[PDB]
């Protein structure tokens, strides 16, 4: 059914910062982002924080692409999935055919990785036999090893692996290649063909993948820096506190998680672009030419002496974002012509529970009841396992429209209440059940003393239980349980 989801080529009307300064975070997010939901345990938010300072981008192409393919075992039960997300390198310079060409490789790279069936190291080797960075991973369940997740990240992509309590466990950092004086560009998947130097998960774990427009807005952390390689990530203390509004709430949807992170990233993005226009307006108000001031260190002499000491530190923080003498006309014209932001995209993937997927397929495909019946004898160990499983399935929320605006995100339950309550009681009774003809009578005794509503699913149970001519005598006494069903009023 909904086992493969890929984002589409979006084009938005991006206003300027001078018009976005009079808007709150709700107005900025609803005009620039979309939501692509796959289930309660996977969702994607894609948009564009790209904007200009005094003009509007009427055809702002979103050059990012995220995808997901959920894989199943031999019996049709989910046992893994493959996720990939790409960031279009460059583009947005005004050439639309260039933007289409960059998105063409960005979308095809994500789609070709998903449609492959090999491991992550062989899949990449085949497809790398117009640039776009990429970040992908593949998790899958092994018999004695459980979930095994192989990762892969190239460029400005970032991966963060949490557990069920939003506690950080691993991070796959981004990269930058020094190609010149201040020319740090992230490596690309297409560079893998140009160079030979290419340089155990658990249930409920949260794998979050984000683009340069997402984690670049949060508090950063330069992990490593060589002579031409820069490993960068986010401050794990600041990224943890983003989950403080989700500590006690049980089982949140991957959309709600991705919504929290994106809201915080766009909150700092909207404030950083406001601080930049407040700084430029405050510099133009001084008219430094009347006092003949051009050196950046003499401008700091002016601001610190005048009383705008916090306007100076604001300017110093941007100088570090990008002493010696540098003129004013260079930095002002540079800041005026800068583009703020990037295409922002994020995908959150929760590792499922084995029992939750065994029950999910048991509900979706009921004809497989006797096939996967002995599997319940293995997973189910206590009625706390089933109650925990169905409690998680109760709070699951899906999105009817796969792709919809982020403000008009309508969700509803992924299971009907009567479908969950009855299926829980069936599996609960099957566990409470699981020596010749004597036990053949005792099975009819426990079923007789029981008085469960909609007990017609005994035939559904008997299939799981069946897996001289005394079988006939018991099923005869089971047609006596039909009298017990007739007694039910
Ligand atoms: Mg980007």
Residue numbers in the entry: 19 to 147, 164 to 233, 242 to 364, 375 to 486, 494 to 526, 544 to 565
How is this structure described in the published paper?
Legionella pneumophila, the causative agent of Legionnaires disease, secretes the enzyme AnkX that uses cytidine diphosphate-choline to post-translationally modify the human small G-Protein Rab1 with a phosphocholine moiety at Ser76. Through crystal structures of Lem3 in the apo form and in complex with Rab1b, we reveal Lem3’s catalytic mechanism, showing that it acts on Rab1 by locally unfolding it. Since Lem3 shares high structural similarity with metal-dependent protein phosphatases, our Lem3:Rab1b complex structure also sheds light on how these phosphatases recognise protein substrates.
We solved the structures of Lem3FL and Lem321-486 at 3.6 Å and 2.2 Å resolution, respectively. A superimposition of the Lem321-486 crystal and the AF2-predicted structure revealed high similarity (0.88 Å RMSD (root-mean-square deviation) on 444 superimposed Cα-atoms). Together with α-helices α14-α17, these three helices form a helical bundle consisting of helices α14-α20. In addition to the catalytic domain, we also provide a structure of the C-terminal part of Lem3, consisting of seven helices forming a bundle. However, a corresponding hydrophobic loop could not be identified in Lem3.
